[PDB]
Design a protein around this ligand. Structure first.
Ligand SMILES: CCCCCCCC(=O)OC[C@H](COP(=O)(O)O[C@@H]1[C@H](O)[C@H](O)[C@@H](OP(=O)(O)O)[C@H](OP(=O)(O)O)[C@H]1O)OC(=O)CCCCCCC
Ligand SMILES: CCCCCCCC(=O)OC[C@H](COP(=O)(O)O[C@@H]1[C@H](O)[C@H](O)[C@@H](OP(=O)(O)O)[C@H](OP(=O)(O)O)[C@H]1O)OC(=O)CCCCCCC
Lengths: 227, 227
């Protein structure tokens, strides 16, 4: 694949994050990315060539396959993985902006050495005191919360879309009724059992990730209330 | 074919018959027998090999053909021709019995030459006077009438059966729904137009024959009333 850039960026962002965020990144790296690339994507290797129908009408097989699978599961999961990673990058960008502000303020104070008072109050407001121990307060906390909410809503929306379109199982026999197939025809899928097992596994993984980020949000809210 | 024996017997029986009976025998020989043997039977030469359906399920073609054609038209017409010829043979047998009685009575009278009175009354009762001019009176008339009625009822029964089973036309496309064919399949006949034309022609011929024998019955009833 080509997941090198996204993996590198996630490795860059995982340095400064909460424990729940680190666990979420770890499970995303292990189960969502590694498992799909290694063995899951090989199952959908001949979902088109092994598909066949019980007719001799030309062109009915392509129409029935297009009717049966509007979009492959592997591509759907890739799109989901892409769409549940942007807000972390947004948080990384905001952290880098905070770092730039810290560097400029440090340069100004080094130049200086009531200005000290305002420099210190600005360094405390952004949570930059130890030169490498950026804390979450004011803006970073807001960005983190909105990122968590966006990730959760994207995941639940994708789950609902998948539930509406396909369901959570693949029957061994599919009934096709569309031109130019005369009347109704019978078509047979390929590897229904493995696909059902992997779909259930991915559903479980998605639910676990949802619960994990919910726990992370609750913990960060409690930490904010602590102050 | 093997119609030689029946044709010979009909040639034997046509010697002594009414004009309507002779015309009926002529039309039966010309249109019913000659036409069917010459060209009509060749049309149903590949009604099985040219039949095909739009499926690749093994054994569906035979089942659909058996569903479509319970009995071929040619065999039905042959059976009809056979079943609308027996009563003429029965009349021929009765005429031969009358001839035997005439020969025995002639032998007895030649032996003799009040007995003359009874011989003459028996020769008049059976209508045997001129030694070769047998007339219809008493028993022959009854046999002729019952033969005509039996022929008419057989013909109308066969016509009704054909109307109930097939109809009077063959559509170019037939819909088949029977195991092991999955759902419904489309099957295509062979030479629908020629078969429809010949079916209509045979129906017209049968109606003409029915009208002819009705006219013959009316004429013979009038002749009987004449006495
Ligand atoms: C049931 C758990 C409920 C809490 C779950 C909390 C989340 C969880 O499960 O792991 C993350 C957590 C915090 O780790 P993290 O390094 O971020 O935080 C440490 C500590 O918990 C305080 O946050 C700070 O020290 P102190 O306290 O001011 O001296 C300081 O962090 P910070 O403030 O400078 O950033 C750290 O010493 O790890 C723990 O071991 C918590 C202690 C209890 C671990 C044992 C379980 C009670
Ligand atoms: C509209 C027709 C209505 C009648 C249709 C009648 C049926 C029809 O169309 O053809 C058969 C018919 C009878 O022929 P067939 O030879 O059986 O009978 C002749 C005749 O008609 C009488 O029956 C008898 O003679 P006669 O009269 O006693 O001297 C004698 O027969 P039979 O008694 O010994 O067995 C015969 O001379 O032929 C005709 O030419 C009828 C005369 C009219 C022909 C012209 C048309 C009027």
């Amino acid at each position: 694949g080509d997941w090198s850039a996204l993996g590198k960026l996630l490795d860059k962002v995982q340095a400064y994050s909460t424990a729940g965020g680190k666990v979420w990144l770890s499970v995303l790296f292990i189960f969502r990315i590694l498992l799909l690339g290694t063995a899951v994507e090989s199952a959908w290797g001949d979902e088109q060539s092994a598909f066949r129908c019980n007719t001799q009408q030309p062109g009915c097989e392509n129409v029935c396959y297009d009717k049966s699978f509007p979009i492959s599961h592997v591509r759907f999961w890739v799109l989901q993985i892409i769409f549940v990673s942007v807000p972390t990058l947004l948080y990384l960008a905001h952290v880098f902006y905070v770092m730039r502000k810290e560097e400029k303020l440090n340069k100004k104070e080094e130049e200086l050495k009531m200005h000290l008072k305002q420099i210190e109050i600005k360094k405390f407001k952004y949570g930059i005191e130890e030169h490498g121990k950026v804390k979450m307060r004011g803006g970073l906390l807001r960005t983190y919360i909105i990122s968590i909410l966006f990730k959760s809503i994207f995941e639940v929306a994708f789950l609902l879309i998948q539930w509406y379109i396909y369901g959570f199982s693949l029957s061994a026999v599919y009934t096709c009724k569309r031109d130019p197939c005369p009347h109704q025809v019978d078509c047979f899928l390929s590897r229904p059992t493995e696909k059902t097992i992997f779909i259930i596994f991915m559903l479980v993984v998605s639910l676990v990730s949802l619960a994990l980020n919910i726990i992370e949000l609750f913990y960060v809210f409690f930490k904010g209330v602590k102050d």
